[PDB]
Design the sequence.
C-alpha cells in the first residue's frame, strides 16, 4: 500500500549509481555510500520495510548492480571494497543467492584471503554466512575451497558482529551440509573452535549460536565422540538453564524442519537446544498471528514425548512452556515402575501416545502393566482389534520405548538390565522377558538359542546371537 | 532429475523445460529420509506418480521409519496395492530413494560407504543392516539366515557377496586462573590453543578445583587489566600452586605489576601475532 511510493523508485537508484561512469576512486566510494544508507532507511521502517526490502533487492538484480558489484570487488587501487561487500550484505536474499552462487564463488573466495582489515572481514564473514544457507553443492564448494577455513580463522577475533557472523555461518553450514560436510567440519576441529564463542561473557546471542552449532554437530552419531572430546557440549545445559525464551525470542517452515530432528534425538544438549529454540519460535509465531505449521511439522508429538519420558527439569520446563504457548494439553510424566502399573496407568499411557482409539478395548480386556509388557502380535491382532499390519509396528515401537525407559526394580534381582545395557543400550527392552522366565546373571551361561526365542521372546536373530556369545563369556 | 538433483545446472535446465512445457515443478526432497514425517511422505508419493495410494498412506500414518521398512505383505494387505507389478514399480521407486537417502542420524560406523564400495546398488541395505544393530565391527559374525530374515536382503547373490566381503575384514597438564568478564576471552583462546597443540587442560567451566590444581602438572595465570586490584579464588589457587612451586607462568596483557608472588617473569600477549606467543609458551612449559 504505502510502500508503492518507494516501489515507483523515486531515486532511480540515484541515476543507476551515477550512470556507472564514475571513473574515480572517490567517486565510486561516495556513490556506494548513499545507495547503502538508502537501503537501510528502506529496511528499518515499521511493518512494510521488510516487504519493500525485497523490492529493492529485485530492482538491483534486474538493473545488474549485482554483477556491477562483483566486478567492483577486484579494483586494487580501490582499497575500499568494504562498502562494496557491506552493500552486498543487505541485498543478499535467496533470489540474489542463486545468481551469486552461479558465478561469484571465485571472487568471493579469493577475497576470503583478505583477513587483515576487520572492517572488511565483518562483511565477508556475513557473505559466507548467507552463502552457506544455500544448497549442499554450494556448501561443498565453499568447504573445499576455503570458506570454512576463513570462518575458522576468525574465531580469534574480537569484533562482536564478526564473531556473530562466524558462529551463525558455522551453524548454517552444519545445518545445510551433508555427511561429508559435517565430517570435514569436525576434521578441521571446529568443535574445539566453538569454545571461545560459546564461552563468552559480553553477549548471549553468540553463546546461543555456538551452542546450536555444536548441538547440530552432536546429532551425527559418527562424530559424537569427536565432538564430546572438545568439551564444548558441557556449556549447553548451564546456558539453557540460565537464559529465558519468553523475551529473548526477539524462521520458516523449512527452517523448523531442521529443528525437529534436534528434538527427536537421544542427546540431552541437542534436545534442550531444540526445545529452547522451538519455544522461542512458538512465542513469536503465536504473537504474530496464528499458524498451525507445528502440527504438520510434527513438533507437537515430539514435545509430548520429551515431557512424558522427560528426566531433566530444564528440558521439561522448556517443553511444558512451549506446549502451553501453543495451547495444548501438557501430558504428565509417567511413572517409571511399569510392572507395577494398573489399568488407569495403562489408559493414560495409551492416551499420551496417540492410540486413544484402542483404549476401550484395552479397558475391556483389563490390561495392566504385567500384561502390557508381555503382549504378542497375535493377541494384538485378534483380541484388541489392531488389524492393520503397520499400526502394530507403531504400537511395538512405542512399547519398545516404554520398555527401554521402564524401571525393573521389583522384578530384576541380579540387575540383568544393566548387563543388557552394557552390551547395547537397545538391549534393555528384553529385561522383563528374561526375568519373567526365571533367568539371572548366574543362569545365562546355560541358556540356548531356542529358549531365547520361544520363552524370552527375542525375535531378531542378531540380538539372540549377540546375547548368547556374550553370555558364554561369563563362565 | 529435478527431485533427486544435486547440480544446479541440471536442476535449472530441468526446471526451465518443465515450465516451458507448462507443468508444475516438483520441489527437491530432503535427503534425511529416516527423519521424515507424514507430510514429507505424502509429497514424495505425489512426486513419483503414486497419488492414488495417498489416502491409504495418510490413514495408516506412514513416516520415514515405516517407509524404509515396508514389506510385500504390508503393501498387499494394509495399503491396498493388489496388483503384482504395481508393487514392483513401488519397490523400484523405494530402491531409488534408499540409494539417494542420507543415513547419518542412525548410521554410526559409516556402513553405507562400505556397502557402496562393494557395489553402488548395495547402498539400499544400510537401514536394514543398522536397524538390526550391526556395524563394521560386527559384520564378520553375521550369518546367511540373518541377512535374509532380519536385514531383509532378498537376492541370494547380494547376500553371498556381502558375506564373502565381510569375512575378509579380519590427567590435566595445565590449569588456568582468570577473573570473570575480564580475561575470559584470553582464557578461552589459550585453552583452545593448548588443546590443539596436544596439551591436556582443565578450565573452570563456570575445593575440588584445588584438587585439580594439585593434579595439574603446570599452572597458567593470566594478567588481565585490573585483575589483581580486587584482591579470593585467584588468591587461593595461586597460593595453592605456590605451595608446590610448579612452573608458574603469568601472561602479561596490560599489567604494570602494582606475598612474594610478583617475583616471576612472563610473556606479553600479542592479539594479532598469534602462534608465536603460543610457540614460546610451549617451550616455556
Sequence:
Amino acid at each position: 500500500v504505502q510502500d508503492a511510493l518507494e516501489r515507483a523508485l523515486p531515486e532511480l537508484q540515484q541515476a543507476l549509481s551515477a550512470l556507472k561512469q564514475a571513473g574515480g576512486a572517490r567517486a565510486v566510494g561516495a556513490g556506494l555510500a548513499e545507495v547503502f544508507q538508502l537501503v537501510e532507511e528502506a529496511w528499518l521502517l515499521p511493518a512494510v520495510g521488510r516487504e519493500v526490502a525485497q523490492g529493492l533487492c529485485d530492482a538491483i538484480r534486474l538493473d545488474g548492480g549485482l554483477d556491477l558489484l562483483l566486478r567492483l570487488l577486484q579494483a586494487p587501487e580501490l582499497e575500499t571494497r568494504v562498502q562494496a561487500a557491506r552493500l552486498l550484505e543487505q541485498i543478499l536474499v535467496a533470489e540474489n543467492r542463486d545468481r551469486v552462487a552461479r558465478i561469484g564463488l571465485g571472487v568471493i573466495l579469493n577475497l576470503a584471503k583478505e583477513r587483515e582489515p576487520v572492517e572488511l572481514a565483518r562483511s565477508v564473514a556475513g557473505i559466507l554466512e548467507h552463502m552457506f544457507k544455500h544448497s549442499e553443492e554450494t556448501c561443498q564448494r565453499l568447504v573445499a575451497a576455503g570458506g570454512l577455513d576463513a570462518v575458522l580463522y576468525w574465531c580469534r577475533r574480537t569484533d562482536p558482529a564478526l564473531l556473530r557472523h562466524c558462529a551463525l555461518a558455522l551453524g548454517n553450514c552444519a545445518l545445510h551440509g551433508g555427511q561429508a560436510v559435517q565430517r570435514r567440519m569436525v576434521e578441521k576441529r571446529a568443535a574445539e573452535w566453538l569454545f571461545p564463542l560459546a564461552f563468552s561473557k559480553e553477549d548471549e546471542l553468540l553463546r546461543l549460536h555456538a551452542c546450536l552449532a555444536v548441538a547440530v554437530l552432536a546429532t551425527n552419531k559418527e562424530v559424537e565422540r569427536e565432538v564430546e572430546r572438545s568439551g564444548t557440549l558441557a556449556l549447553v545445559e548451564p546456558l539453557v538453564a540460565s537464559l529465558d525464551p519468553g523475551r529473548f525470542a526477539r524462521r520458516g517452515p523449512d527452517d523448523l524442519q531442521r529443528l525437529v530432528p534436534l528434538l527427536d534425538s537421544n542427546r540431552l544438549e541437542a534436545q534442550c537446544i531444540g526445545a529452547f529454540y522451538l519455544c522461542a519460535e512458538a512465542a513469536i509465531k503465536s504473537l504474530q498471528g496464528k499458524t498451525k505449521v507445528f502440527s504438520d511439522i510434527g513438533a507437537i508429538q515430539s514435545l509430548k514425548r520429551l515431557v512424558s519420558y522427560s528426566t531433566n527439569g530444564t528440558k521439561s520446563a522448556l517443553a511444558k512452556r512451549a506446549l502451553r504457548l501453543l495451547g495444548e494439553e501438557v501430558p504428565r510424566p509417567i511413572l517409571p515402575s511399569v510392572p507395577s502399573w494398573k489399568e488407569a496407568e495403562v489408559q493414560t499411557w495409551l492416551q499420551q501416545i496417540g492410540f486413544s482409539k484402542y483404549c476401550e478395548s484395552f479397558r475391556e480386556q483389563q490390561v495392566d502393566g504385567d500384561l502390557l509388557l508381555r503382549l504378542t502380535e497375535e493377541e494384538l491382532q485378534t483380541d484388541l482389534g489392531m488389524k492393520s499390519g503397520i499400526t502394530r509396528k507403531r504400537f511395538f515401537r512405542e512399547l519398545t520405548e516404554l520398555k527401554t525407559f521402564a524401571n525393573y526394580s521389583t522384578c530384576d534381582r541380579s540387575n540383568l538390565a544393566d548387563w543388557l545395557g552394557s552390551l547395547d543400550p537397545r538391549f534393555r527392552q528384553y529385561t522383563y522377558g528374561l526375568v519373567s522366565c526365571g533367568l539371572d546373571r548366574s543362569l545365562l551361561h546355560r541358556v540356548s538359542e531356542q529358549q531365547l526365542l520361544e520363552d524370552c521372546g527375542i525375535h531378531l536373530g542378531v540380538h539372540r546371537a549377540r546375547i548368547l556369545t556374550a553370555a558364554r563369556e561369563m563362565l | 532429475l529435478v527431485s533427486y538433483s544435486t547440480n544446479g545446472t541440471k536442476s535449472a535446465l530441468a526446471k526451465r523445460a518443465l515450465r516451458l512445457l507448462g507443468e508444475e515443478v516438483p520441489r527437491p526432497i530432503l535427503p534425511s529420509v529416516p527423519s521424515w514425517k507424514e507430510a514429507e511422505v505424502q509429497t514424495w508419493l505425489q512426486q513419483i506418480g503414486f497419488s492414488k495410494y495417498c489416502e491409504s498412506f495418510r490413514e495408516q500414518q506412514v513416516d520415514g521409519d515405516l517407509l524404509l521398512r515396508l514389506t510385500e505383505e504390508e503393501l498387499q494387505t494394509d495399503l491396498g496395492m493388489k496388483s503384482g507389478i504395481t508393487r514392483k514399480r513401488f519397490f523400484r521407486e523405494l530402491t531409488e530413494l534408499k540409494t539417494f537417502a542420507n543415513y547419518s542420524t542412525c548410521d554410526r560406523s559409516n556402513l553405507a560407504d562400505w556397502l557402496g564400495s562393494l557395489d553402488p546398488r548395495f547402498r539400499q541395505y544400510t537401514y536394514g543392516l543398522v536397524s538390526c544393530g550391526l556395524d563394521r565391527s560386527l559384520l564378520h559374525r553375521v550369518s546367511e539366515q540373518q541377512l535374509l530374515e532380519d536385514c531383509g536382503i532378498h537376492l541370494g547373490v547380494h547376500r553371498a557377496r556381502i558375506l564373502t566381503a565381510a569375512r575378509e575384514m579380519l590427567t590435566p597438564d595445565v590449569f588456568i586462573s582468570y577473573r570473570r568478564n575480564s580475561g575470559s576471552q584470553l582464557a578461552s583462546l589459550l585453552k583452545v590453543h593448548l588443546q590443539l597443540h596436544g596439551f591436556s587442560v582443565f578450565i573452570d567451566v563456570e575445593d575440588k578445583l584445588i584438587q585439580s590444581v594439585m593434579g595439574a602438572r603446570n599452572f597458567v595465570l593470566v594478567l588481565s587489566p585490573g585483575a589483581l586490584d580486587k584482591c579470593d579464588w585467584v588468591h587461593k589457587e595461586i597460593v595453592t600452586a605456590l605451595s608446590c612451586g610448579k612452573n608458574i607462568v603469568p601472561i602479561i596483557d596490560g599489567f604494570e605489576w602494582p606475598q612474594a608472588v610478583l617475583t616471576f617473569n612472563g610473556i606479553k600477549w600479542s592479539h594479532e601475532y598469534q602462534e608465536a606467543t603460543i610457540e614460546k609458551i610451549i617451550r616455556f612449559l
The CA atoms of residues 222 and 251 of chain B lie 5 Å apart. Chain B is about 45% helix and 5% strand.
